Amino acid sequence: SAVQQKLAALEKSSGGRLGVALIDTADNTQVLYRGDERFPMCSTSKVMAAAAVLKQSETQKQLLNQPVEIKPADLVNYNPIAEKHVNGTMTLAELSAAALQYSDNTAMNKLIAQLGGPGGVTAFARAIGDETFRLDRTEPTLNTAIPGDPRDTTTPRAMAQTLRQLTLGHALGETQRAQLVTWLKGNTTGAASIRAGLPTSWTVGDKTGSGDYGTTNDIAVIWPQGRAPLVLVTYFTQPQQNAESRRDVLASAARIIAEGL
């Protein structure tokens, strides 16, 4: 299609490897570019950890209000919110919000611990039918994004389907789904990524990710005004370990997708 030729040209111009999956929930049509290739998830994995905790809260009704101590030893490389609460507590809801809306890496590690390790995050993916997602490491090493390394990867197709199920489907309870949507809509890190390629009038909930090898990711649910929502995953990684981030590639991919709907 025209869209796949334009995405291929964008990729060629960028020097890296681009993966895109779009689901249009109007007709359940999909647009895929490198849709079944593995990409390092980096912080887009935080969505799965937060959603796993939300699933636990369907049975443990008070779980999100549980205080969790933030100790100095818990801090890792990027902790914008947890830093503000060292030697204090944050609830699991506050940790989930921090992980999602500020990409806080300490918060992610606390979510992983609550789930019993990375295997507990992966288990949740399997339980909702995602056989592709794998979380192997904690923060910050899950962002190494080494070419060929299957650790901490998923595919665009799988992540788009999972994000659809978590936000627009019923993999979570009604209260939990609404909370996840609220959290994604309040993301603060996405302005230069998918959102920048879309009409300003559309409502977006997203989670970005970034890592080594210039890995630059964003996953989004998109609510256009007067039109069924869309799920869009954009993954991008580069051949040089120290490559700079390329959020503009994600914005451009979103813009190409948005032409034609």
- Annotated domain spans of the chain: 1-261
- 234, 217 in Cβ contact below 8 A? yes
- 47, 128 in Cβ contact below 8 A? no
* Annotated catalytic residue within 43, 45, 103, 210: 43
Which structure tokens are listed for 208?
A: 């970005």
- On the 0-12 / 13-18 / 19+ scale of CB atoms within 10 A, 131 is exposed
Angle value at C-alpha 4, between 260 and 148, nearest 5 degrees: 135
The number of beta carbons lying within 10 Å of the beta carbon of residue 169 is 14
Which structure tokens are listed for 194?
A: 């998918």
Which structure tokens are listed for 170?
A: 């019923």
Chain breaks in the chain following residues, C–N > 2.5 Å = none
Structure determined via: X-ray
> Pick from 202, 200, 191: which is nearest to 229 by CA?
202
Interatomic CA distance for residues 105 and 163, integer angstroms: 20
Active site residue 103: no
**Type of residue at 203:** T
Interatomic CA distance for residues 108 and 77, integer angstroms: 12
Reduced to 3 states, what is the DSSP secondary structure of residue 259?
coil
Interatomic CA distance for residues 42 and 99, integer angstroms: 12
For the domain made up of 1-261, the CATH class stated in words is alpha beta
| Bridge partner list, 208 | 218
Interatomic CA distance for residues 236 and 17, integer angstroms: 6
**Type of residue at 164:** R
| Bridge partner list, 91 | 67
Which structure tokens are listed for 62?
A: 């008070």
Interatomic CA distance for residues 224 and 97, integer angstroms: 24
Kindly give the residue spans of alpha helices, DSSP state H, lying in 102-140: 105-114, 118-127
Residues in the chain: 261
Torsional class of 235: left (φ above 0), alpha (ψ -120 to 50), beta (otherwise): beta
Kindly give the residue spans of alpha helices, DSSP state H, lying in 15-78: 46-56
Strands in the chain per DSSP E? 17-24, 29-33, 39-40, 67-70, 88-91, 153-154, 203-211, 215-223, 230-237
DSSP string, 184-210: HHT-SS-TTTGGGGS-TTSEEEEEEEE
The number of beta carbons lying within 10 Å of the beta carbon of residue 100 is 29
Angle value at C-alpha 251, between 35 and 245, nearest 5 degrees: 85
